[PDB]
Amino acid sequence: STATLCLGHHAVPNGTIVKTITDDQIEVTNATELVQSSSTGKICNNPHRILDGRACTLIDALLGDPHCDVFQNETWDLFVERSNAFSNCYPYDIPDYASLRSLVASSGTLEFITEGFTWTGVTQNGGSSACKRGPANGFFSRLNWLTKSESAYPVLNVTMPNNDNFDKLYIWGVHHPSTNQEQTNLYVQASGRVTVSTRRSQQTIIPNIGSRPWVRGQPGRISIYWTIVKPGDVLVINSNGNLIAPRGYFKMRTGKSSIMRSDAPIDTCISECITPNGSIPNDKPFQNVNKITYGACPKYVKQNTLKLATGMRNVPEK
Amino acid sequence: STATLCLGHHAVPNGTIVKTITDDQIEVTNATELVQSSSTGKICNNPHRILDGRACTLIDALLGDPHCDVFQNETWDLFVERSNAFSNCYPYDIPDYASLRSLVASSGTLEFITEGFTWTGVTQNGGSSACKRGPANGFFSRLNWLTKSESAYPVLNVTMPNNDNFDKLYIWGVHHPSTNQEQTNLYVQASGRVTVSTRRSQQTIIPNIGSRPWVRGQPGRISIYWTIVKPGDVLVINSNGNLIAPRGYFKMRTGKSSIMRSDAPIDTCISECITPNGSIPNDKPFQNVNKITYGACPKYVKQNTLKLATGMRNVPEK
Amino acid sequence: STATLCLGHHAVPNGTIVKTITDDQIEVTNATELVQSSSTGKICNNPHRILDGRACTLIDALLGDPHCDVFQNETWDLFVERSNAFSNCYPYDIPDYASLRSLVASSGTLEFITEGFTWTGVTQNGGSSACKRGPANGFFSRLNWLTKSESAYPVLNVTMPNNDNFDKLYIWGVHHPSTNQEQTNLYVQASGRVTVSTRRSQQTIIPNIGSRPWVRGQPGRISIYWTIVKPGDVLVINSNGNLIAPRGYFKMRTGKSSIMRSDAPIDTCISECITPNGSIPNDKPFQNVNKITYGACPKYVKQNTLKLATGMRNVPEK
Amino acid sequence: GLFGAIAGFIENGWEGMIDGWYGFRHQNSEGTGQAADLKSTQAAIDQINRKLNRVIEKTNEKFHQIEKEFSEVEGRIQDLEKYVEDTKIDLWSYNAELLVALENQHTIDLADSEMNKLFEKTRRQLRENAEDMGNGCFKIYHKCDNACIESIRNGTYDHDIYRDEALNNRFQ
Amino acid sequence: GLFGAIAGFIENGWEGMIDGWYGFRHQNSEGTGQAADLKSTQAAIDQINRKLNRVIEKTNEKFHQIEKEFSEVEGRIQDLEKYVEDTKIDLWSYNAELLVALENQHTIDLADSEMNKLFEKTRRQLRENAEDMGNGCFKIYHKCDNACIESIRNGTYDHDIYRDEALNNRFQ
Amino acid sequence: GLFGAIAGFIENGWEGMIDGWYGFRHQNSEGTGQAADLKSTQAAIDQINRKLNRVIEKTNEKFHQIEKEFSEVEGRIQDLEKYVEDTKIDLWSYNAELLVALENQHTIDLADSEMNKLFEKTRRQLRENAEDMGNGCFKIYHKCDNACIESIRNGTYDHDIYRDEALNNRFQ
Ligand SMILES: CC(=O)N[C@@H]1[C@@H](O)[C@H](O)[C@@H](CO)O[C@@H]1O
Ligand SMILES: CC(=O)N[C@@H]1[C@@H](O)[C@H](O)[C@@H](CO)O[C@@H]1O
Ligand SMILES: CC(=O)N[C@@H]1[C@@H](O)[C@H](O)[C@@H](CO)O[C@@H]1O
Numbered sequence A, B, C: 001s002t003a004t005l006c007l008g009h010h011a012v013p014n015g016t017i018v019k020t021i022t023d024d025q026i027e028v029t030n031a032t033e034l035v036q037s038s039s040t041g042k043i044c045n046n047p048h049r050i051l052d053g054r055a056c057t058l059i060d061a062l063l064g065d066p067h068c069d070v071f072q073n074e075t076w077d078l079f080v081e082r083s084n085a086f087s088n089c090y091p092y093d094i095p096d097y098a099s100l101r102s103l104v105a106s107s108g109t110l111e112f113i114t115e116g117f118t119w120t121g122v123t124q125n126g127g128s129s130a131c132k133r134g135p136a137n138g139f140f141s142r143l144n145w146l147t148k149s150e151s152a153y154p155v156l157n158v159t160m161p162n163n164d165n166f167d168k169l170y171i172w173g174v175h176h177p178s179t180n181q182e183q184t185n186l187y188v189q190a191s192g193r194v195t196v197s198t199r200r201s202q203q204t205i206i207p208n209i210g211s212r213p214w215v216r217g218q219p220g221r222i223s224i225y226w227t228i229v230k231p232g233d234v235l236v237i238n239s240n241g242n243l244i245a246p247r248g249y250f251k252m253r254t255g256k257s258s259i260m261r262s263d264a265p266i267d268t269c270i271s272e273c274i275t276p277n278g279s280i281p282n283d284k285p286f287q288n289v290n291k292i293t294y295g296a297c298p299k300y301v302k303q304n305t306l307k308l309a310t311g312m313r314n315v316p317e318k
Numbered sequence D, E, F: 001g002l003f004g005a006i007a008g009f010i011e012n013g014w015e016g017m018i019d020g021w022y023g024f025r026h027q028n029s030e031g032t033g034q035a036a037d038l039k040s041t042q043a044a045i046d047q048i049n050r051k052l053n054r055v056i057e058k059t060n061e062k063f064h065q066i067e068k069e070f071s072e073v074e075g076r077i078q079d080l081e082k083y084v085e086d087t088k089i090d091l092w093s094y095n096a097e098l099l100v101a102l103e104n105q106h107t108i109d110l111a112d113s114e115m116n117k118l119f120e121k122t123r124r125q126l127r128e129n130a131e132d133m134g135n136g137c138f139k140i141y142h143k144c145d146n147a148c149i150e151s152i153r154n155g156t157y158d159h160d161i162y163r164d165e166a167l168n169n170r171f172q
């Protein structure tokens, strides 16, 4: 007459190992993976405007090194430097290289407006062998090498107002001759001087002669500096020698633009998140590809795998 | 014959919504708030000693710009720099201005102690039409503009020992003429040199001549530096031109003094936690007014609202 | 007739108070500490190769201060500087001292490889009474003080290629005369210069004459600089005065080496964790010893104690 | 709630209950009545207040720190300063989000438990004199006037005095 | 598990139940059957789904940041850039580990809890007509055919109708 | 405790028990006894032990880092070196504090659960032979000597053997 009713849960053959507070190893019936641990080997050309630096460094593209003149006025949500880019122009040094690269990469543009700088008493557009724009001599497309004119180097002094409503990025630099004969010979004065100032800032440099390892045959070097001039402020360049004058300025903007060191080929797809290792899907809280990422991404975690249990404990039958 | 006892629980008319490990929305009978989101708008005047920089920046008060004389030796828990401060003295420039603003700010005092330096062979207390102190030409109160005397400028060399038990912060500087003529005229030597040292350190700065943009009519510029002398050490200033000598020192102290940039009015009340948007209540764990804080403040977080269920789950009633 | 069965749990005489989510104080039958708060007061001699600087600063050692030659080429897992160490060689000053000390400490070795000098035209091995080496006037072991020779200081210019397979760490310096008479008298030129470059960098330093407070009787000083030459690159030293030349180079390796300032005595035991307080046990998850730590250790935390309950709730009995 | 009392085997709530979080509602020869259980209610409030306090009375001070807004573009150093403060914020915004999540989930289960605890306490008191009707109500198989109900609510109910009258009803 | 039903007083699960997480198996006069409880299985699912969603639907965008790999030795400033990124990584890894540990424990306990509600839901229906055999089975002390078993499964069963029969078989 | 057993319906613990966590205490014809339940005790201990190991055997290595003490004022750069370190410690000190809190709060409930699993395990065994007195004690309605009791404790108790004898005492 009795009847028998038994309640029961389900169960499965292959369960999932999960950790819990009271168990670094237990077996449930189901879970998902939270640690995105794979890549696709490539960078999606979208949605982020990508720019392959190819053989050029953001810097060189900025200065105007011949083989990068293709990059002029480029924009980029993400500039991508490659391990094989090279510089093919006059030997240069940039104290605080890091910071220039960073503030340019972040502005994410290279619009360059040329201004009418007047250099009276000096010769312009000088060139060098180490910087062959074509088979003939040249220089950085954005810089003006200035040399003596009719046996003399004036106390250069030019003003250039910033009457616009945005900031201007002027980058210039000074020349460090290999020997005294080369100094006197190029600028006449046995000792040069460059002063670039505004109402807010002032940086003055003093060339320094000496011989340095040959690079594209040049023992001497050009040190590179930058100056930002705010709206309403004015730029004043004062120099009686060794000045590598400005030709204009770079428009500065504020955005989500940046740069990344990578060799991943750039393909055509959609990936909000980008890593040096290429694109990776943003559906998992965590990821184990590269601490280095760009865009909507999953926090990087030492752990290469974490399983979120999503089903009851799995208690099999025998 | 029989009775009926029924256990139950309360239920309110309008519960509050809260998130749980399995609900970003469920309804309880009550919740408190863990995120302070509003500010009185003003900075309460006293659990902390607040000093209003009015028209002066901590630096200009430190150097002694004429209209910042009211701040001579002021002390503070939190210095408030107003966005509309301005400089009305000689054109200057401080390399690493930020670090100097920071160490003075943390010192929390402008106690200036005048010592008896010995400037033999030069004229003292030079002044400028750019730092008018009254109808006349003044200069920074804590600085001494030395120029040539009776057709000469000695190889100035002075010594000031630290026979105290506390540290002395010396603030001196050097002058950058606008032309060679100004150089030889004020200092005679066609090239200046300033070397301020201790047994612990040295910093020798060389003036750089050239035209900078007119600021209150002045083309030149004064470059400012600083030196910390420890008890048992002595200061030694050696310069044969262009030295903007010290008049003593500022006693350095350690505390919880700091500085903040805000335009909020200061009022009379009692508030431990100050922010650029005004004081706020530290009775909550998280705040959303601003990441900038002074005092016993609530940890800042992005979300603007987080409800802590302080009541059971509300289940309507029919 | 009948019987009575009761179920229960234990309790103890003296339990342990514990904090939960609904009590900052609640007794449990037992717990275990998670905050290592005590130290032996001595640093175990290993498994970490420890090196006691004794009275030498990792910099003084590197430079070769007489009483620190004992460390010539030592190696270390953890260099330990003492509060009583001192310097007794010529007065020096290193711009970005912190940085040098750092990069060396992490290299964990003083491997010095003397190289071929080429100082043709100058008097070598300059020495000072402020740096006695026995009865004689010595100087840092790794540095070569160059002066004039037969009334004249050549326009020194040497080259040193990096043909090995590891980065070389050269450290040189430039001397600052106390007076002009000293300048001319030592380097003949009235204005010295030192430039040490590579195909990758270039740093040119200019001497600065002036009087500084005596140090072991000397008013002059040596500013010290370093350069890292990369494999395939080459070093070049161009100077016509005031150069304190390099004798060779240090081999730079990468590992787990580092430095710590402690007066803790180095005893003979085995401890994985080292702190300025001596070694400590790493069996717990957190420590309140020191935030400064070397090796495998627990995370510093502000709390001096956190009891992790390991038993149920202790309930007395009236 | 892991115990399934509130918003479970117990259909609704009582907006009628003003003096407590949990209570009794009977119906006997004398009519109906209602009353909150002070020992139960206080039990959960005390627990929730403690929990709340663990989270409110605590804040630490910080005075001099690092700048957080800048006027000019600097570069490397300024990048780091902003990354650090941002990192701090993201982490802290995280704990804040989890805390409440955890706290609230536990808070509703706690409230559910304490309801269930009150039922068991009551079922155990009536012993063989009533039966669980499954909806949070007990059917007391014996006359139980206002007094008798009261004795149950203040836990002085003597199951013996009625076991026979009830045993009859229940098993007849 | 906190309610000790799953992997508890219910020796083990059924691999043959492919239509839900919870359900019934019976053996009455007309043979043996097996139905699943949708109400139950669903409730657990919905709960574990929402828990999941909270955890996966969230990511933060981070464009220009600080560098993290270096081609040359620098010292002070670089050591700092590293410590910052290394400290950051370690904090999240801790957040990530603790997250799943906590989430999982609560997942497993939530399933156990559900299982048990269905058992206690069932128990209260059967009243004085059945007994808890201890293996998760209810021994219905009266004749309960497939029409009867079903009435129980989605709570339409009426204890009164079979009480007298049951009591008779129980207390004999 | 969410399960209201320990510090709940079970008045208090037993200082007299020194060989285990949970156990029984009887008072049969032959006097009174006491014996700790190994199975249940071990379950508790094992779980909280793992819990423990998950927290103790883990610490990572860090060597060359950043200076954390300074002998002279520097400014911007240093301010950052402190602020970074300070923010790290505050975050960690927070993780620790919340970890014990959660953990403990759980260890306390886990134990209160395990107890309740034992109470329930027994109740079930005794079927209709006993009655929950409400204090964690069952009143067995039939002569139960030491051999009888023993059987319960190691779960081989044959509820039938005494059902009649028991049913009669219960309902008379
Ligand atoms: C697709 C899905 O979400 N199911 C998961 C599977 O992905 C996972 O690999 C396994 C163990 O981790 O558990 C479940 O079967
Ligand atoms: C190199 C080149 O094509 N010049 C253009 C310039 O004519 C134009 O005015 C500017 C506007 O931003 O963009 C580019 O710089
Ligand atoms: C590494 C380096 O700069 N070497 C150059 C060499 O190339 C050149 O031929 C010579 C000029 O006479 O000067 C140096 O030796």
Ligand SMILES: CC(=O)N[C@@H]1[C@@H](O)[C@H](O)[C@@H](CO)O[C@@H]1O
Binding pocket: A276, A277, A288, A289, A290, A291
């Ligand atoms: C995720 C992956 O494929 N691993 C590599 C790692 O080995 C390498 O060191 C790094 C360099 O950028 O890139 C990736 O992180």
Ligand SMILES: CC(=O)N[C@@H]1[C@@H](O)[C@H](O)[C@@H](CO)O[C@@H]1O
Binding pocket: B030, B031, B032, B310, B311, D052
């Ligand atoms: C704990 C809290 O702040 N919440 C409030 C409490 O202050 C107040 O006493 C209660 C009135 O019943 O409503 C809420 O629970």
Ligand SMILES: CC(=O)N[C@@H]1[C@@H](O)[C@H](O)[C@@H](CO)O[C@@H]1O
Binding pocket: A159, A234, B212, B213, B214
């Ligand atoms: C910005 C600037 O310095 N311009 C000044 C101008 O103000 C001044 O009237 C003139 C003096 O002769 O020199 C420069 O032109």
Ligand SMILES: CC(=O)N[C@@H]1[C@@H](O)[C@H](O)[C@@H](CO)O[C@@H]1O
Binding pocket: C072, C073, C110, C111, C112, C113, C114
């Ligand atoms: C191991 C190594 O780097 N070689 C040098 C060795 O040439 C030299 O004689 C000694 C100096 O005292 O230091 C190191 O041993």
Ligand SMILES: CC(=O)N[C@@H]1[C@@H](O)[C@H](O)[C@@H](CO)O[C@@H]1O
Binding pocket: B157, B158, B159, B236, C211, C212, C213, C214, C219
């Ligand atoms: C050569 C000379 O006259 N210089 C002195 C020098 O002796 C001394 O070290 C210093 C401190 O008194 O003052 C001057 O520099």
Ligand SMILES: CC(=O)N[C@@H]1[C@@H](O)[C@H](O)[C@@H](CO)O[C@@H]1O
Binding pocket: C037, C038, C039, C276, C277, C288, C289, C290
């Ligand atoms: C655990 C202990 O003894 N604390 C000391 C602290 O008092 C001392 O000032 C510090 C020095 O750096 O070392 C340790 O932290």
Ligand SMILES: CC(=O)N[C@@H]1[C@@H](O)[C@H](O)[C@@H](CO)O[C@@H]1O
Binding pocket: D147, D148, D150, D151, D154, D156, D157
């Ligand atoms: C502590 C308490 O309230 N006890 C009362 C008791 O005084 C009263 O006689 C009985 C009948 O109403 O109810 C409760 O048992």
Ligand SMILES: CC(=O)N[C@@H]1[C@@H](O)[C@H](O)[C@@H](CO)O[C@@H]1O
Binding pocket: none
């Ligand atoms: C009492 C004692 O010697 N402890 C000191 C403490 O005073 C100081 O604030 C700290 C500095 O970080 O070092 C030690 O902990």
Ligand SMILES: CC(=O)N[C@@H]1[C@@H](O)[C@H](O)[C@@H](CO)O[C@@H]1O
Binding pocket: F146, F147, F148, F150, F151, F152, F154, F156
């Ligand atoms: C293995 C075990 O403990 N079983 C014993 C059984 O041997 C014994 O006959 C009975 C009487 O005390 O008690 C338990 O059932």
Ligand SMILES: CC(=O)N[C@@H]1[C@@H](O)[C@H](O)[C@@H](CO)O[C@H]1O
Binding pocket: A157, A158, A159, A236, B179, B211, B212, B213, B214, B219
């Ligand atoms: C001596 C001299 O010529 N200086 C001028 C000066 O008037 C002006 O401040 C500046 C800006 O135009 O230009 C300089 O050349």
Ligand SMILES: CC(=O)N[C@@H]1[C@@H](O)[C@H](O)[C@@H](CO)O[C@H]1O
Binding pocket: B072, B073, B111, B112, B113, B114
């Ligand atoms: C005590 C001190 O050092 N403070 C000086 C004080 O000596 C001087 O008499 C006073 C005059 O205003 O100005 C303060 O700056």
Ligand SMILES: CC(=O)N[C@@H]1[C@@H](O)[C@H](O)[C@@H](CO)O[C@H]1O
Binding pocket: C113, C114
């Ligand atoms: C005295 C000493 O220890 N130093 C010698 C040194 O004489 C020799 O020229 C050098 C070359 O590497 O190697 C060391 O053995």
Ligand SMILES: CC(=O)N[C@@H]1[C@@H](O)[C@H](O)[C@@H](CO)O[C@H]1O
Binding pocket: A211, A212, A213, A214, A219, C157, C158, C159, C236
């Ligand atoms: C012109 C001169 O004499 N200086 C040479 C220079 O050409 C070369 O860069 C260097 C490298 O060996 O050697 C210098 O002595």
Ligand SMILES: CC(=O)N[C@@H]1[C@@H](O)[C@H](O)[C@@H](CO)O[C@H]1O
Binding pocket: B159, B234, C212, C213, C214, C219
């Ligand atoms: C401040 C200092 O160092 N003074 C010394 C002093 O010992 C000595 O009396 C004097 C004689 O020239 O030389 C100075 O350099």
Ligand SMILES: CC(=O)N[C@@H]1[C@@H](O)[C@H](O)[C@@H](CO)O[C@H]1O
Binding pocket: C030, C031, C032, C310, F052
């Ligand atoms: C003295 C005591 O009873 N405390 C014990 C301790 O011996 C054991 O090693 C530790 C590990 O969890 O936990 C407690 O149970």
Ligand SMILES: CC(=O)N[C@@H]1[C@@H](O)[C@H](O)[C@@H](CO)O[C@H]1O
Binding pocket: E146, E147, E148, E149, E150, E151, E152, E153, E154, E156
């Ligand atoms: C409400 C409901 O649908 N439950 C069904 C009922 O309608 C049906 O009459 C009976 C016969 O199978 O079985 C129950 O389970």
